[PDB]
Design a protein around this ligand. Structure first.
Ligand SMILES: O=C(O)c1ccc[n+]([C@@H]2O[C@H](COP(=O)([O-])O)[C@@H](O)[C@H]2O)c1
Ligand SMILES: O=C(O)c1ccc[n+]([C@@H]2O[C@H](COP(=O)([O-])O)[C@@H](O)[C@H]2O)c1
Ligand SMILES: O=C(O)c1ccc[n+]([C@@H]2O[C@H](COP(=O)([O-])O)[C@@H](O)[C@H]2O)c1
Ligand SMILES: O=C(O)c1ccc[n+]([C@@H]2O[C@H](COP(=O)([O-])O)[C@@H](O)[C@H]2O)c1
Lengths: 212, 212, 212, 212
């Protein structure tokens, strides 16, 4: 079958930290394709004058003609900050049963997994790949002890089947943050080379994140 | 025409949480002026030995020399308190036909709006801006479902014309409350830097909220 | 065997609201003994100049001469703070096999149960009695949906055996809070008739909660 | 003898988070004097166009007319950076041997104490008061487990003598950061009510933190 990744994020904006992390994990997992999955949030949770539509277009600009990288907009086509399990169920019915699904998770996010909705059917539909980094600790709550026990494999190449396991991977992400880029733009400064050149171009063309 | 804001509340006392939220909304909506609106209440629900007129002075001290901020005392210059809609009509008679008016209110205060007088006419005279924050839900009563349906606009910069629409905004206000502040002052402790300096000195000079 | 309740809390200080709830629980459940369980916390989270041993002293004063009601200081002694499940295994180590143990917890405290350490093991040792009250929600975390549909008993007299089940009880506690009681005492005011009489004398005789 | 606090910070700028902290600490500790001590750093480590002098000017504005709160410029009056043990040795020289010195450190900084220069020397000259607050954590390095075993006291009132012990104090600091203020300023936004009013005045007077 195919090997599909899912990379979820707010992407406000998408930057080279995200993009370098998606290139790397596609290569480490030999994915057919890695889908960036821009997250839904309440409209008043959006950066003022940056719509969920423009977060979407910037990711689109980001993956434009990039090998093995796509954008899944399906959470933004819903109605509210839906559930990842809904997204997992929806992607699944579009895949073959032998296709394998990998959902990229940052360590800090994974440590709150039992605070997600129906969090125990997640692995029913995919494998979870948890992003280890310089910063984000690596000792989970007891709440996750038995999950790691029943489901983790230490070799990311070890993952078998369409879904069901958890592995860990290591990246050294460039130290680039959406918050820092928003601050620079607000001060009329250049975020050139902090973001993909096509995303830069979109941000400048549409004059995004500009000081009130 | 001008963009006019209304920000209601008891202000017992006015403090930085109130004031930072004003600054922020007057900025977010590019207002010409934001009016702090001290509300009237029965004399017996005043804090003992802090009057309706001293609540007013403290808000005056708070906006003295601040840009875009003023005080409308109109609800305190009446028999007893009244209803918001009357204030709306009164403000809207001193206003130009195309002046835009924005009444800021909290989320929980928002959910109780069907229990306000002539609540369906409120929006005849202003747009309503609703303050969302952490630890103030976002699941309105059924009794408001048709209202949001007829009037909500996602994009707070999309409010059009003099009034008639509702939109939601996000703030994370300082962790500061009047209740907390009255308690401190009761214990003779300093509330400096919980309130504007002006207000601090008014409270200290008139020995407000002292233990009786 | 015996019917024995546990009622945890910080009790800073124990007051009339807490003690009435105890009295009502013990009656209801026909308890042989109800143990007020003051909880441990780091020394830095205590109220200034009111120590753990003083919290326990007040609780002893509140139950002195009140048959059926007693104090358990076990979570206090132990060098550093406590996990409920450990408190339960120790209580159980002293209790005959057929003793019935009832742990009383508030609603909000209840929904957060999936955060407690080894939360799925708590009911190995006791029944859990949930205190439902006005101004206390009626919608719990999805995390608990299994547990409730697994272990709920609608009728409190239907708890059977030493433990294993949960049930919900209604009460309308007195409009008193230790936060308010601490602020009154900081102002030099009286809190007589908000705390039990013997608690009032202790507070006054040791000048607890006064202004620094 | 006197009771005197030292509160070191970078203060870039001093904001209402720092000042509320200093007010609560003086109160708590019954300090005759709390001296804010701005940190020296190399020139290329300053904020562009905001000089150490100007960091010191803002702290002076912040404490003006606040009795008991003062500033100590002596680390700036020295060449390249000071080591805090040198800072305390020089303070001490000036005080009565029986004056008590309290040095306020936030939990995260204290956690790296064994890295500071001649770290085991500091308590010769003062008490260390380590502030805990909602965000760091409660777990230390091995490297501090014995200093803590040897030198701490659970009660701040427990601090005895001119120096020698370590204690821990709780506060809920307002969620203000100098990073967030610098970005807002760089964007032409107001930081009114996020900084003390006399600091706001100085910032605007001198157009500090203004975009290039
Ligand atoms: O499925 C849910 O119940 C679930 C609930 C919370 C987290 N999520 C998703 O995971 C994301 C986690 O990113 P973050 O920045 O909150 O760590 C969050 O932004 C959502 O897309 C999903
Ligand atoms: O005009 C109404 O009927 C009206 C009814 C409820 C409350 N208000 C507004 O909502 C605020 C909330 O405070 P309260 O005590 O009136 O609920 C009150 O201070 C006014 O701002 C106004
Ligand atoms: O056992 C835990 O994991 C635990 C975590 C939270 C609350 N409980 C109990 O209920 C008390 C409530 O206070 P708190 O801050 O722990 O929520 C606490 O003092 C504990 O005895 C216990
Ligand atoms: O004495 C040292 O070795 C020394 C080295 C590290 C930190 N300190 C103190 O901590 C200050 C700030 O460093 P930090 O950890 O808060 O980023 C520094 O400016 C001094 O107040 C002092």
């Amino acid at each position: 079958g195919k090997r599909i990744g899912l990379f979820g994020g707010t992407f406000d904006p998408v930057h080279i930290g995200h993009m370098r992390s998606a290139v790397e994990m596609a290569e480490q997992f030999a994915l057919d394709e890695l889908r960036l999955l821009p997250n839904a949030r309440p409209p008043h949770r959006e950066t003022p004058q940056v719509s969920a539509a423009q977060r979407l277009a910037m990711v689109e600009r980001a993956v434009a003609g990039v090998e093995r990288l796509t954008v899944d907009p399906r959470e933004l086509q819903r109605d509210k900050p839906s559930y990842t399990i809904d997204t997992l169920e929806s992607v699944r019915a579009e895949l073959a049963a032998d296709d394998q699904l990998f959902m990229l998770i940052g360590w800090d996010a994974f440590c709150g997994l039992p605070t997600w909705h129906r969090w125990e059917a997640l692995l029913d539909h995919c494998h979870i790949v948890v992003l280890q980094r310089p910063d984000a600790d690596s000792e989970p709550p007891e709440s996750l002890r038995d999950l790691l026990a029943a489901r983790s494999v230490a070799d990311p190449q070890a993952l078998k089947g369409p879904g069901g396991q958890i592995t860990f991977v290591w990246q050294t992400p460039l130290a680039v943050s959406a918050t820092q880029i928003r601050a620079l733009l607000g001060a009329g400064r250049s975020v050139r080379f902090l973001v993909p050149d096509a995303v830069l171009n979109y941000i400048e063309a549409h004059h995004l994140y500009r000081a009130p």
